[PDB]
């Protein structure tokens, strides 16, 4: 997103 | 997977 | 804590 | 651990 | 940066 | 690396 962001959902799901 | 292991595919999938 | 924060402290503790 | 090895328990643990 | 932070730049840089 | 792994010098350096 810059910056490596881990979202939580289970799975994490990282987006830059 | 124990240990946080972070797929690529984008978008990082990580899995414990 | 949502996203995966990873606080320090060494070692990193990772919390959603 | 090199690379940071991220270990699970609950709480992640980082270690180098 | 405390937290463990992700920077994109590829290649991506962890500062504390 | 596929995975994505953090490796020391500091500095982490993530690489796919």
């Not at 910056?3 to 990282?14: D, E, M, Q, R, T």
Request: net charge positive; glycine share 6%; no cysteine.
């Amino acid at each position: 997103v810059a910056k490596l962001v881990f979202f939580a959902k289970a799975a994490i799901i990282g987006l830059m």
